[PDB]
Design a protein around this ligand. Structure first.
Ligand SMILES: [Mg+2]
Ligand SMILES: [Mg+2]
Ligand SMILES: [Mg+2]
Lengths: 226, 226
């Protein structure tokens, strides 16, 4: 079981290459995750200088396999069942009244560590919009990630809207259309309609001088009573 | 100087006695805070059995002295300046279309540990409202705490509205009116209009059988340009 790969603490690596309205950049992340608690600890760093977009807009893109599934619903955990071969995660993130990101990533074990390699492309973003104008507050709110089975793809789909608070007191919605596919050929677990109660907390390393992001998250599956 | 008491890691003790619509309960919390980073780590446990109200409703009540104040605005940090004697923190939490909370706490040092002792009274709550009916999700969102000086009372005031996500996709608002006053006779610092950008993340200790809540907080002061 890919399940047995998460009984303890697992090292994590995240590599991301992006291009937003022609502005290229890269961010690396490292840390560890504990699916038993459903928690992650991660430090991200923009290795190409300043991040051309706000850090929060990248949170969802930057390993739901570290979600905590209650004992009664461990059969709905597609994420772990696809390990160690892993899965492909794709998304179309539409910022209300602004541009959109299209992401494609692979989440699989590479040795003793879980790695999330991402490629991101954004287009049609407004010059001085909330995104390119850095008008989002440096924080994050709680969201429910609704998952449904995608039998034809032998994976899953996810649909949700991220709420990014703007410094002007308004909210910038970020519609998310997710699609996950197993990498290997073996059978996986096609969960029932449920969601992931995910929370994130963004902070900074007063000692780090590079553009970065300290992220702590807690995810617990739910929606299926028992 | 009070500020000098927060340069490193500080043990935290929290004791709360509550009474909502006649239901008495108590919660004990322990952990630590590091104002250099502006983070806290606490574990609360309902010592009287099960909490009669949803845990998220008690978050704001359960030590803003642990907020991180940037170097350019360290003279606006009232909380630390009142230490070690501490300050009284009082609040009136009005849940929209439902009952309200009235809290009085003393925040001060008891040895080398910062202690927050609270007394809470809740009234006119609906037997099957979001609160007593426990319809709140177990999560929390980001909020800005706007602080203003209160020369007359020789302290500060605070106003903000907490957004409590409901299990049916709706949102329950909790209007907060805060008032802080030094406990000692010693002179404190009167801030300039600014705010505390705060984030809270709720989780559960998988090995804890008692009714409890693990909380992770990140608070950074802002609003003052420089
Ligand atoms: Mg929100
Ligand atoms: Mg007592
Ligand atoms: Mg309602």
């Amino acid at each position: 079981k890919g399940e047995e790969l998460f009984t303890g603490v697992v090292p994590i690596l995240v590599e991301l290459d992006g291009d937003v309205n022609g502005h290229k950049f890269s961010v690396s992340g490292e840390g560890e995750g504990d699916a038993t608690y459903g928690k992650l600890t991660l430090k991200f760093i923009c290795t190409t200088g300043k991040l051309p977009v706000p850090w929060p807009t990248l949170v969802t893109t930057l390993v739901q396999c570290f979600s905590r599934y209650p004992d009664h619903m461990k059969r709905h955990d597609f994420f772990k069942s696809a390990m160690p071969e892993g899965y492909v995660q794709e998304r179309t993130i539409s910022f209300k009244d602004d541009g959109n990101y299209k992401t494609r990533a692979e989440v699989k074990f590479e040795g003793d560590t879980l790695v999330n390699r991402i490629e991101l492309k954004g287009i049609d973003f407004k010059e001085d919009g909330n995104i390119l104008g850095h008008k989002l507050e440096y924080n994050y709110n709680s969201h429910n990630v609704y998952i449904t089975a995608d039998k034809q793809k032998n994976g899953i789909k996810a649909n949700f809207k991220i709420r990014h608070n703007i410094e002007d007191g308004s909210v910038q919605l970020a519609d998310h259309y997710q699609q996950n596919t197993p990498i290997g050929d073996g059978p996986v677990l096609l969960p029932d309609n449920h969601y992931l109660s995910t929370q994130s907390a963004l902070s900074k390393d007063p000692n780090e001088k590079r553009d970065h992001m300290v992220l702590l998250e807690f995810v617990t599956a739910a929606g299926i009573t028992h």
